[PDB]
A paper describes a structure:
The AAA ATPase Vps4 drives the ESCRT (Endosomal Sorting Complexes Required for Transport) pathways that mediate membrane deformation and fission in a wide range of cellular processes. Vps4 is monomeric or dimeric in the cytosol, and assembles to form an active hexamer upon concentration at the membrane/ESCRT-III surface. The central pore of this hexamer is thought to be lined by pore loop 1 and pore loop 2 (residues 203–210 and 240–248, respectively), which are highly conserved in AAA ATPases that act on protein substrates and play a critical role in substrate translocation. The leading model is that the upstream factors recruit ESCRT-III subunits, which polymerize through their N-terminal domains to induce an inherently unstable membrane configuration that resolves by fission following Vps4-mediated disassembly or remodeling of the ESCRT-III polymer.
Guided by the insights that Vps4 is active as a hexamer that is stabilized by binding of ADP·BeFx and the VSL domain of the Vta1 cofactor, we used S. cerevisiae proteins to prepare a Vps4-Vta1VSL-ESCRT-IIIpeptide-ADP·BeFx complex for structural studies. Vps4 subunits A-D form a right-handed helix that is created by the three very similar interfaces formed by the A-B, B-C, and C-D subunit pairs. These interfaces each bury ~2000 Å2 of surface area and appear fashioned to coordinate ATP, with R288 and R289 from the neighboring Vps4 subunit positioned to coordinate the ATP phosphates. The D-E interface (~1700 Å2) is similar to the A-B, B-C, and C-D interfaces at the central pore region of the hexamer but deviates at the nucleotide-binding site, where the large AAA ATPase domain of subunit E is rotated by ~15° so that R288 and R289 are displaced by ~2 Å and are no longer able to coordinate see the nucleotide phosphates. The Vta1VSL dimers, which are pairs of helical hairpins that form a 4-helix bundle, stabilize the ring by forming struts between adjacent Vps4 subunits. Consistent with their more clearly defined density, the Vta1VSL dimers bound to the β domains of subunits A, B, C, and F also contact the small AAA ATPase domain of the following Vps4 subunit, with Y310’ and surrounding residues at the hairpin end of the second Vta1 subunit contacting α6 and α7 (residues 300–330) of the small AAA ATPase domain of the second Vps4. The primary contacts are with pore loop 1 (residues 203–209) of the A, B, C, and D Vps4 subunits, whose closest Cα atoms are ~7.5 Å from the helix axis that is defined by these loops. The peptide lies approximately along the helix axis, with Cα atoms modeled 1.0–2.7 Å (average 1.6 Å) from the axis, which is consistent with the model that substrates are translocated along or close to the helix axis, with some variation allowed to accommodate distinct amino acid sequences. Pore loop 1 of subunit F is displaced ~14 Å from the helix axis and is therefore completely disengaged from the substrate.
Residue numbers in the entry:
A (entry chain I): 280 to 330
B (entry chain B): 119 to 364, 369 to 433
C (entry chain A): 118 to 364, 369 to 433
D (entry chain H), E (entry chain S), F (entry chain R): 289 to 330
Write the structure that this text describes.
């Protein structure tokens, strides 16, 4: 129960990070910065598979 | 009857504030959501009563209070430490009682207090009678026996939150740290503070600016933009020589010997009919070389202490 | 004919709404209910308590317990801060105290509450011992009057700083009670009270998981994590794009992009009432737990263990 | 197009975020993808 | 001691009760035991 | 039952407490037992 409870906390943390990276990607396209975007929108996706 | 009331009408939009989406969220749900949706707040679900803002100087705290004051559509009171501390013995405290009293009379309402550190600090016996009487009335009158804690809202600001006493820290039940702005927020403040002035740069050039300006405050941005707006006056009145360009006559500073370069001083030139060269990137970088960041980093370590604990 | 401003209306909070407090609950039931319901027991040698102090760290439930006594009083509940006692000139600062206990005895049976007694007391030098030593002295006589008027009134004192309270007034408040931070079960109870009529999602042992997660809060900390928990579904209503009908004629709630009946809209688009908020989930609770670390500090708890360990 | 394609990625990446607010990994892994592919289509 | 041992059993048997208010049989079966053993220690 | 069995243990463990208020170890050692056995009957 203790280990599963922490796993829930940990997955919640990863989801927060994925959403953060997406927000940062969006913010980046507001300067047409495709570089940053294609990267954060990726570091994020890979991590949603790491879930 | 004392009646030391004061309130006013400023003008600051939401979106002129950069970053701070947690504070924007908490104040929209603390201001707009009670007025627009009073039916959601009923019984067990109650609005927030005490909200604290804190951080390093010039991260946008009082300007955010201006934005709440414009976007309030409510009786926005505001009081410093001046109007609370009275002469004799008794009006120092009864004015606090009348402040929250008439604040509840004009409900729904919002109360802002700037630099609440001048009213706290019960530890020790320094600042004895003013701290115990006035601070005691702030506690009990803020919530107590029969105070209607619903309705009004107490906005606290400070620069020193660790000297704030833990009891008033509990009174301000939802506290928010306001950091230095990051890259994108300072890009936004650059693109706001250029305003209607015809600039020369693009958005990623403002990104180059914010990358160059790592770790400023909002006032630092305001003065490098100010200096950037004060370079063309220096060039339009500098040395000798202006020139016509283009609604009837219009002259700007130009180098000695140029296409239509007359020799004169700004003094020689007629009201209005003088225009300065549009802000340029060099003026920005010159303003970056003009001024350090204001804040110190060990104070940032204490802000990370109180923020890391109570934020 | 220089009367004051008092309490008349009682703020309705129930007696069961508080948690812990069993010594204070015992002392106030035997100090309030037992004299009125059983006046024949208190006679001669057996006398009711005259001075009761509450104290402790901020937000352990002191003034809220005073609210509970105020609702459950069925008596003329006076209440006075340090404001109404300290007057302008020289004389009304003290005669108002005399009229306070006087008219308090006129409306007997009755209860008197004084919050933040350290603002009443507190001497350091000549300025602190002027126009507060007089009012303190009148309190000293008017609560020496246990041999004068034993029955009738009761003085309830509250504070957050009991060590700066003077020893004479400490003797005046003859039965003092420390109010600690609450434990697991009391915070489980305050969770189950402060959820109220809102349709929750959890069970009792899930509230036990909450109180286990929240080791060492105050009552205000509980009030604001429950408050934030009551703000999270409206944050879901404000958030994203997309609602959905469920189920008395049309009712829509926020749902993820692309779902069973997921229309794309904003809360603004949706009709009065016919909104459905998300039921409080443990995730909103745990997010609210991560939102606010405890308020009170543990060295202040060491001073409460100092004054409690001595005088409690 | 383009000025819009760049605008639709954000539209996607938002929905994706909004989706993770219900832990819906399915939708997410998809929109966060339809978006990325499109940033390469740029 | 004793005057206290008799007081700590009650302290236990209370916690035990308080525990069953969350159906926590574990804690209960334990405190209601640490208590009993101690009433025999009397 | 059960929802009640869990309620009767408390009923017991209370009586037991109430009993120690007269130092009555006999009653106590018994109710605190009839209770425990029953928490195992759960
Ligand atoms: N985030 C911001 N967005 C816009 N202007 C800002 C921001 N932060 C600071 N400023 C500007 O910098 C100045 C300092 O902000 P202000 O709130 O007055 O600081 P303080 O709270 O310390 O008084 C103000 O004139 C304000 O216009
Ligand atoms: N035992 C309790 N049960 C329910 N709510 C409580 C309890 N203790 C404190 N609270 C809540 O916490 C807040 C603080 O209670 P109160 O006695 O007024 O403390 P304080 O005067 O020190 O701020 C109030 O909003 C009250 O509703
Ligand atoms: F002027 Be700020 F409030 F630091
Ligand atoms: F009554 Be509390 F400690 F403010
Ligand atoms: Mg300020
Ligand atoms: Mg209090």
């Amino acid at each position: 129960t203790k280990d599963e409870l922490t796993k829930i906390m940990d997955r919640a943390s990863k989801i927060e990070q994925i959403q953060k990276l997406a927000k940062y990607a969006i913010s980046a396209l507001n300067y047409e910065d495709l570089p940053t975007a294609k990267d954060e929108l990726t570091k994020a996706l890979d991590l949603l598979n790491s879930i | 009857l004392s009646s030391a009331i004061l309130s006013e009408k400023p003008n600051v939009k939401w979106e002129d504030v950069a970053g701070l989406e947690g504070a924007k969220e908490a104040l929209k749900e603390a201001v707009i959501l009670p007025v627009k949706f009073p039916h959601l707040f009923k019984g067990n679900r109650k609005p927030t009563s005490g909200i604290l803002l804190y951080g390093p100087p010039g991260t946008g705290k009082s300007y955010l209070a201006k934005a709440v004051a414009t976007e309030a559509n409510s009786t926005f009171f505001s009081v410093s430490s001046s109007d609370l501390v009275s002469k004799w013995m008794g009006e120092s405290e009864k004015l606090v009682k009348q402040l929250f009293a008439m604040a509840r009379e004009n409900k729904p309402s919002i109360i802002f207090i700037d630099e609440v550190d001048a009213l706290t600090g019960t530890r020790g016996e320094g600042e004895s009678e003013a701290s115990r009487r006035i601070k005691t009335e702030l506690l009990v009158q803020m919530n107590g026996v029969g105070n209607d804690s619903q309705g009004v809202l107490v906005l606290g600001a400070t620069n020193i939150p660790w000297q704030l006493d833990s009891a008033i820290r509990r009174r301000f039940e939802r506290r928010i740290y306001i950091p230095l702005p990051d890259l994108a927020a300072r890009t936004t403040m650059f693109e706001i503070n250029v305003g209607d002035t015809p600039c020369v740069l693009t958005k990623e050039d403002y990104r180059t600016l914010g990358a160059m300006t790592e770790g400023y405050s909002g006032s630092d941005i305001a003065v490098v933009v100010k200096d950037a707006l004060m370079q063309p006056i220096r060039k339009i009145q500098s040395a000798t020589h202006f020139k016509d360009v283009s609604e009837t006559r219009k002259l700007t500073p130009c180098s000695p010997g140029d296409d239509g370069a007359i020799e004169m001083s700004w003094t020689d030139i007629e009201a209005d009919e003088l225009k300065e060269p549009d802000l340029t990137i060099k003026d920005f970088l010159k303003a970056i070389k003009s001024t350090r960041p204001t804040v110190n980093e060990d104070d940032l370590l204490k802000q990370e202490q109180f923020t890391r604990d109570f934020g």
